[PDB]
């Protein structure tokens, strides 16, 4: 129990932090990855002067603060502001003292060696956690779907990745990163919806375009004869009621937004798209392992939640793969937390105890110890 209860799992994202206790089924804490700094001197009624704001209080009060994102494209870019988000996570969100809890953290696919050593330096030397561990994100997603070999298409708020994993070892030279994700996708909907003849003028109009994207957006299979369908004008249309009455209608654009993930050309991106990239990762891997990867395309991440994403991907890679092959696109329902759940499982596991980096290992080996 000492640490059975006690292991923490913190998944640091570009848009959201997911956090909680190893053992739980889902994150106890989910909140924006921002750190707000007040543009003016003054106070809220009853509070003192605050130097900084994190998560939702930074979002809610955004009009008087300069908002900053510590993690650009999955990589920690500002370490002063990240130690601020961690502090908030332990002390306010989970309300635990960190110096008696083992902490499993996550990093990104080709996270620079030096960063994995730096967050270890900050975990052990400024938070004084007993022990910690850094798992790679795609690797926890895979594992949370039971398996050990597969290829994860991972897509969240600032990055998309393909991480081919074989008997647990993520394959460095076959990993692909595509910098277009849910953030890019909300801003494109924004324009095709103002372009539908609308105005997201106040900040209460801006924010909810993102809630339109999440609730009403679709990834149609045969996106071709779906536009064609749009035109005959079926009961395909969908009206959403705004903060007030102002019933906005979205028929068609509803799927023009996730067609951006297959066609980056919709947004002036010259890069290849999700399905081709799944494939290219795969023809960059060893030959003998390619049947395995093809029958185990695990999807994880908030942006892979658009319904019919899996069917489109299913047919997208069947038709690029040699017919002798078995294609299989696994997309679980909890996928917006796969990464986290994979960490919860792993860290609550009976056999993981012997991989925890302890302060004994650290004080004796330097940050190098956990770096592997």
């Amino acid at each position: 129990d000492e640490d059975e209860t006690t292991a923490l799992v913190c998944d640091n994202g570009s848009g959201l932090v997911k956090a909680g206790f190893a053992g739980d089924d889902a994150p106890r804490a989910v909140f924006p990855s921002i750190v707000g700094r007040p543009r003016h001197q003054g106070v809220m009624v009853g509070m003192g002067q605050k130097d900084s704001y994190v998560g939702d209080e930074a979002q809610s009060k955004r009009g008087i603060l300069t908002l900053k994102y510590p993690i650009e494209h999955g990589i920690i870019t500002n370490w002063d502001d990240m130690e601020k988000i961690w502090h908030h996570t332990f002390y306010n969100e989970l309300r635990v003292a960190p110096e008696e809890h083992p902490t499993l953290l996550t990093e990104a696919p080709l996270n620079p060696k030096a960063n994995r050593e730096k967050m270890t330096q900050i975990m052990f030397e400024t938070f004084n956690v007993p022990a910690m561990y850094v798992a790679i994100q795609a690797v926890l997603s895979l594992y949370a779907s039971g398996r050990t070999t597969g290829i994860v298409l991972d897509s969240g708020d600032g990055v998309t990745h393909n991480v081919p994993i074989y008997e647990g070892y993520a394959l460095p030279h076959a990993i692909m990163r595509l910098d277009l994700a849910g953030r890019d996708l909300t801003d494109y909907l924004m324009k095709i919806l103002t372009e539908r003849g609308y105005s997201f003028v106040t900040t209460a109009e801006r924010e909810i375009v993102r809630d339109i994207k999440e609730k009403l957006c679709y990834v149609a299979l045969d996106f071709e004869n779906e536009m064609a369908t749009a035109a005959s004008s079926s009961s395909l249309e969908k009206s959403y009621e705004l903060p007030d009455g102002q019933v906005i209608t979205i028929g068609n654009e509803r799927f023009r937004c996730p067609e951006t993930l297959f066609q980056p050309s919709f947004i002036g991106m010259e890069s290849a798209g999700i399905h081709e990239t799944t494939y290219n990762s795969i023809m960059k891997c060893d030959i003998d392992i390619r049947k395995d990867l093809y029958a185990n395309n695990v999807m994880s991440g908030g942006t892979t939640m658009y319904p019919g994403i899996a069917d489109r991907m299913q047919k997208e890679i069947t038709a690029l793969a040699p017919s002798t092959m078995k294609i299989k696109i696994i997309a679980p329902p909890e996928r917006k937390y796969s990464v986290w759940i994979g960490g919860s499982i792993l860290a609550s596991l009976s056999t993981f105890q012997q991989m925890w980096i302890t302060k004994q290992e650290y004080d004796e080996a330097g940050p190098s110890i956990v770096h592997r």
Binding site: Y143, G146, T148, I345, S348, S350, T351, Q353, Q354, M355
Partner: protein
């Protein structure tokens, strides 16, 4: 034992007799030991005996 030799005044030195078994115990209960390997794999959705 050691109390007697202390009570009497005999001069006998000896190592804890438990120690002999610590080897086996560590292998089972320690971190990279049987149980752990056992309880980790239990976290792998597609592990085998």
């Amino acid at each position: 034992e050691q109390e007697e030799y202390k009570k009497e005044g005999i001069e006998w030195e000896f190592i804890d007799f438990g120690m002999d078994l610590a080897a086996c115990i560590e292998l089972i209960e320690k971190p990279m030991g049987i149980f752990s390997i056992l309880e980790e794999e239990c976290m792998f959705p597609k592990a085998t005996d």
